[PDB]
């Protein structure tokens, strides 16, 4: 059912674990089948597991890690601070991001929003 606050801290931390190791099939599986992702926030959202897998396959040398604890509410919502490290066109750089996800009655990410822009890109 609708995850509890403590359950949310876990799912979201799990998500970063997966993104960090790059297990794409496992990552795509945490989302609801018809989920919508807005990354970065402001851009048109991607919808459904097919498009989400496509996105992650395209994006993931990349390590990620929580930079602070996971803030959670009681209606299945959470937000977390984390850093994404990579190597763009040979050049190494880091991006500071905050993710806001909403889970469904099955513990799957129903909607997710990523907050970040160039001002957070430290290259």
Q: Which residues bind ligand EQU (CB under 6 A)?
A: 19, 39, 59, 62, 84, 86, 95, 97, 99, 114, 116
Which member of 1, 75, 88, 123 binds its own copies (CB under 8 A)?
A: 75
Q: Which residues contact 39 (CB under 8 A, 6 or more apart)?
A: 46, 55, 112, 113, 114
Which of ligand EQU, its own copies, none lies near 84, with the C-beta cut-off 5 to 8 A by kind?
ligand EQU
Q: Closer to ligand EQU at the Cβ: 7 or 20?
A: 20
Nearest partner of 110 among 78, 68, 74, judged by Cα? 78
Contact partner at residue 28 from ligand EQU, its own copies, none, CB < 5 to 8 Å by partner kind: none
Strands 63-66 and 77-88: antiparallel
Helices (H), 30-116: 48-59
Among 14, 25, 62, 117, binds its own copies (CB under 8 A): 117
Beta pairing class for 91-103 and 77-88: antiparallel
Of 29 and 117, which CB lies nearer to its own copies in the complex structure? 117
13 interacts with, out of ligand EQU, its own copies, none, CB within 5 to 8 A per kind: none
Distance CA 28, CA 113 (A): 15
Binding mask 51-70 toward its own copies (x if CB under 8 A, else -) reads ----------------xxx-
């Amino acid at each position: 059912n609708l995850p509890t606050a403590q359950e949310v801290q876990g799912l979201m931390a799990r998500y970063i674990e997966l993104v960090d190791v790059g297990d794409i099939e496992a990552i795509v599986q945490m989302f609801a089948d018809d989920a919508t992702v807005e990354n970065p926030f402001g851009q048109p959202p991607i919808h459904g597991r097919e498009q989400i897998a496509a996105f992650f396959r395209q994006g993931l040398k990349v390590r990620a890690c929580l930079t602070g604890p996971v803030r959670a509410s009681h209606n299945g919502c959470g937000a977390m601070p984390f850093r994404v490290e990579m190597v763009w066109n040979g050049q190494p750089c880091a991006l500071d991001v905050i993710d806001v996800m909403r889970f469904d009655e099955h513990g799957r990410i129903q909607t997710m929003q990523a907050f970040w822009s160039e001002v957070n890109l430290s290259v």
